[PDB]
Design a protein around this ligand. Structure first.
Ligand SMILES: [K+]
Ligand SMILES: [Mg+2]
Ligand SMILES: [Mg+2]
Ligand SMILES: [Mg+2]
Ligand SMILES: [Mg+2]
Ligand SMILES: [Mg+2]
Ligand SMILES: [Mg+2]
Ligand SMILES: [Mg+2]
Ligand SMILES: [Mg+2]
Ligand SMILES: [Mg+2]
Ligand SMILES: [Mg+2]
Ligand SMILES: [Mg+2]
Ligand SMILES: [Mg+2]
Ligand SMILES: [Mg+2]
Ligand SMILES: [Mg+2]
Ligand SMILES: [Mg+2]
Ligand SMILES: [Mg+2]
Ligand SMILES: [Mg+2]
Ligand SMILES: [Mg+2]
Ligand SMILES: [Mg+2]
Ligand SMILES: [Mg+2]
Ligand SMILES: [Mg+2]
Ligand SMILES: [Mg+2]
Ligand SMILES: [Mg+2]
Ligand SMILES: [Mg+2]
Ligand SMILES: [Mg+2]
Ligand SMILES: [Mg+2]
Lengths: 225, 33, 48, 103, 136, 65
RNA sequence: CAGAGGUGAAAUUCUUAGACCGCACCAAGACGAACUACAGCGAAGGCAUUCUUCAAGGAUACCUUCCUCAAUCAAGAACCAAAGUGUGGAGAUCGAAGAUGAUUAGAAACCAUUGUAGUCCACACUGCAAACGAUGACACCCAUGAAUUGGGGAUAUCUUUUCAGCACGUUUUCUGUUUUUUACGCGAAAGCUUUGAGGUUACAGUCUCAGGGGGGAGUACGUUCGCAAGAGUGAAACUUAAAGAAAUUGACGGAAUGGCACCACAAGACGUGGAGCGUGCGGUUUAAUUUGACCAACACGG
């Protein structure tokens, strides 16, 4: 039986997520040189943001957060933020025809390091008084909007740590600031951060990892049944 | 059937036949030359 | 030379020779993986 | 004998010279994007009968949280649009009528 | 006998990948990372005719086999990720997509998040076929 | 052998028209998981509204075509 | 961990050697989805990610400058999709030739798996497209209604901590662009219509290219250009009464829509087709085997 070799582990999200011990995984019992701890590190776990944050509303059900296992603590897989992405159905439903889809790509490095790419998407909106068949935007205004989004994200995200940056993206604080400062340039139906991804990471720090996880909930996987 | 009568074989392939014939006459004259 | 001789100028045996051929015998296409006109993307020559 | 004033495509005589072709959704035939028949499709992931069972067994989905749907931009060549009944031949007078919104 | 040390009745989540092609259907249960797979059953493992590999009944039988194995492994809830062949080929899901998902739901399995994850190129290579397409 | 009641006849499907498509309400006990569950089935032979069927498998549902 | 792929169905093909599938990764070469429109730009060919750049180009605005400097063109010159050619590079995907598996009476095809040249880049050739709006360029008049792109005038709504005395948007106007619906007039008609195919027998604004029944034939020869493929130029002998064009009515469709029929099918029932025999038809034979009829002929000419 294949499941005889399998041991169960708990995946723990960092402390800035309400539900810590999300998801469960299996791994081959360390049958020699094939150590479970060595093979577990680097595994990426994808979870829905609504499940991670129970208090979150409707908008958080359309975002997925991926976590990379940075260390194996007993039966607890302490993880770090890897990427955040909007679901396929929500993103496809946002596209409307008679308007321009404006996309921005911003690459910033946080205080810990952690270079990340942001992938902002925006859509133009007809005015309430407007009756024109289209609401296409002048490329001058699109470039201005792209410039302002780039500056704001670079300014805000480069002075904070990785945990604060994840909190800003998860709680829609950065997105709300963007949409509030970008509407004067151009009437926006919706400004959304489509996908965040960490592209570069600093040398592995466990002290900073232990500081990022706060108080680690225990796992009873290794305990007697 | 976007076209009317070719009236005696598809003109494209007739042109191809004429082209091969021209090449054959060319080589024959080259042999004689 | 292994290729010399004959009433016609020809190699009478395959010119692709083994990697282990002793010196004097290792002439021609030495340990060739393929022959012909390559015919496609040129593979990177040399060992792996 | 010009069948159509627009020659079956959205390319007036002094707008452009070339529109980049796209592959047909079904057969893959390369046709200009303006000429190809384009339908935006919002298809339910499951039919009503099966969605009822899945929503019954799903804590996530129910009367308050709708299930996801498939969004596809489908562009057909003329032959595949006709064969799949997306468009049909029409009487000469009715060939002119056009639609701008999905009705 | 197999399953996490959790209170009886608590939901243990796997991820079911439903690859529904027009030639076959895949019902593949992994963990949330996707690295470890508990059970993979295809529609062609349940039928003897190649034409019946992608039938809805074959997908239903494959899903029931998956449910039995997932019950043995301790998995009792599933996030679903459905895909078509995607890429440059057709984006329409196969016949067995609905059949597999309905069979999983009816067999007592709890269903979590549902997502469509068919590969979508932002710009693609040349599609199979000529510029005249497949001619039938 | 679940017994189902025909509540309405949708129409005569098939090329030859021999098979008809009906809406079937399962005749289950009160409080059963199949109580008042309706499915669409293809029926061979002369069938009328308020007829009863013996369904071998209740999972399958006939295509609406 | 046992199949995967592919198809009307299969097989060529891959697969315990671990294929397919799943996740996170890489590499390389293309490409730039949805947004993408009877939209924009460009002389045409053509041109879609972002940022930073280099020349430009048009439109608009102007009580700026100048003062016919223009329109169009033999000869002559430059650019020009794809295919093709040469030399380097690239080769992910797809794929002429070829191969194999199917399907066929045959199938050198369509379908499947492949696969070379090619596809991509640089430089240099080639300059033959349904290079089409099948509509040469410039200039003038020209009826109506909704729009649309760009720039300006004048005067309801939304956002408003910086490329910002903003941006959009309303109404009206205007110049310039790509158009659409429905007035003369024109046309053989289809149709065109300030975007002419209108303002033409009431025939004259200017320039220029091309055509004169069909073929032979864009062939032969000569000659120029090209590496070659070819390109430009271009006959005649001979043959032929039509070839064409647009509409009309039929008929037909392995094109749609709606109906209908046991001389149709479905659900079935009795059969016929197998045996013997009666009868009619054919053939054979014969002096003659009298003849008509071949779904709508053959127990029918009662
Ligand atoms: K020799
Ligand atoms: Mg606009
Ligand atoms: Mg026709
Ligand atoms: Mg015609
Ligand atoms: Mg003609
Ligand atoms: Mg010797
Ligand atoms: Mg010799
Ligand atoms: Mg020799
Ligand atoms: Mg233009
Ligand atoms: Mg063109
Ligand atoms: Mg069209
Ligand atoms: Mg198969
Ligand atoms: Mg066909
Ligand atoms: Mg492997
Ligand atoms: Mg794009
Ligand atoms: Mg080329
Ligand atoms: Mg070349
Ligand atoms: Mg060389
Ligand atoms: Mg291939
Ligand atoms: Mg020409
Ligand atoms: Mg012409
Ligand atoms: Mg413009
Ligand atoms: Mg008009
Ligand atoms: Mg010539
Ligand atoms: Mg009847
Ligand atoms: Mg009759
Ligand atoms: Mg009779």
């Amino acid at each position: 039986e294949t499941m005889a070799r399998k041991e169960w582990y708990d995946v723990v999200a960092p402390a800035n997520f309400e539900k810590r011990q999300f998801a469960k995984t299996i791994c081959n019992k360390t049958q020699g040189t094939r150590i479970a701890a060595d093979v577990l590190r680097g595994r990426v776990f994808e979870a829905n943001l609504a499940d991670l944050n129970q208090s979150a509303g409707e908008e958080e059900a359309y975002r997925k957060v991926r976590f990379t296992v940075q260390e194996v603590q007993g039966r607890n897989l302490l993880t770090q933020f890897h990427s955040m992405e909007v679901t396929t159905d929500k993103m496809a439903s946002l596209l409307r025809k008679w308007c321009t889809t404006m996309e921005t790509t911003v690459e910033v490095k946080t205080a810990d390091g952690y270079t990340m790419r942001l992938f902002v998407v925006a859509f133009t909106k007809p005015q309430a008084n407007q009756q024109s068949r289209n609401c296409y935007a002048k490329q001058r205004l699109v470039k201005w909007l792209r410039m302002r989004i780039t500056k704001m994200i670079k300014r805000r995200l480069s002075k904070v740590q990785i945990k604060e940056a994840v909190s800003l993206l998860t709680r829609n604080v950065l997105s709300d600031a963007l949409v509030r400062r970008c509407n004067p340039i151009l009437p926006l139906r919706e400004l959304r951060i489509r996908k965040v991804r960490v592209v570069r990471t600093p040398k592995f720090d466990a002290q900073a990892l232990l500081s990022a996880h706060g108080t680690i909930p225990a796992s009873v996987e290794a305990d007697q049944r | 059937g976007t076209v009317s009568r070719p009236r005696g074989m598809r003109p494209k392939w007739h042109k191809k036949r004429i082209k091969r014939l021209k090449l054959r006459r060319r080589r024959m004259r080259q042999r004689s030359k | 030379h292994p290729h010399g001789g004959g009433n016609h100028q020809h190699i009478g045996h395959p010119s692709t020779v083994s990697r282990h051929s002793p010196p004097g015998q290792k002439v021609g296409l030495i340990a060739a993986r393929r022959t012909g006109r390559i015919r496609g993307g040129k593979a990177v020559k040399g060992a792996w | 004998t010009t069948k159509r004033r627009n020659h079956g495509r959205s390319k007036p005589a002094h707008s452009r010279g070339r529109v980049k072709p796209i592959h047909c959704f079904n057969c893959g035939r390369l046709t200009p994007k303006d000429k190809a028949v384009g339908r935006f499709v919002v298809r339910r992931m499951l039919d009503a009968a099966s969605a009822r069972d899945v929503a019954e067994a799903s804590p996530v989905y129910g009367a308050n949280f709708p299930m996801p749907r498939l969004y596809m931009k489908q562009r057909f060549c003329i032959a595949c649009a006709i064969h799949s009944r997306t468009v049909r031949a029409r009487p000469v007078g009715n060939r002119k009528i056009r639609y701008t919104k999905k009705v | 006998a197999y399953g996490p040390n959790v209170k009886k009745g608590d939901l243990v989540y796997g991820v079911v990948h439903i690859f529904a092609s027009f030639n076959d259907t895949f019902v593949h249960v992994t963990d949330m990372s996707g690295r470890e797979t508990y059970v993979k059953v295809t529609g062609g493992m349940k039928v003897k005719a190649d034409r019946d590999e992608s039938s809805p009944y074959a997908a239903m039988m494959a899903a029931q086999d998956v449910v039995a194995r997932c019950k043995e492994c301790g998995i009792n809830a599933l996030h679903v990720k459905m895909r078509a062949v995607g890429g440059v080929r057709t984006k329409s899901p196969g016949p067995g997509a609905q059949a597999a998902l309905r069979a999983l739901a009816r067999a007592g399995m709890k269903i979590g998040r549902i997502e469509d994850v068919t590969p979508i190129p932002t710009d693609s290579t040349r599609r199979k076929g000529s510029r005249r397409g497949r001619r039938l | 052998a679940q017994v189902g009641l025909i509540i309405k006849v949708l129409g005569r499907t098939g090329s030859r028209g021999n098979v008809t498509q009906v809406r079937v309400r399962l005749m289950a006990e009160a409080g059963s998981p199949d109580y008042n569950r309706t499915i669409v089935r293809n029926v061979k032979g002369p069938c009328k509204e308020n007829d009863m069927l013996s369904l071998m498998e209740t999972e399958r549902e006939a295509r609406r075509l």
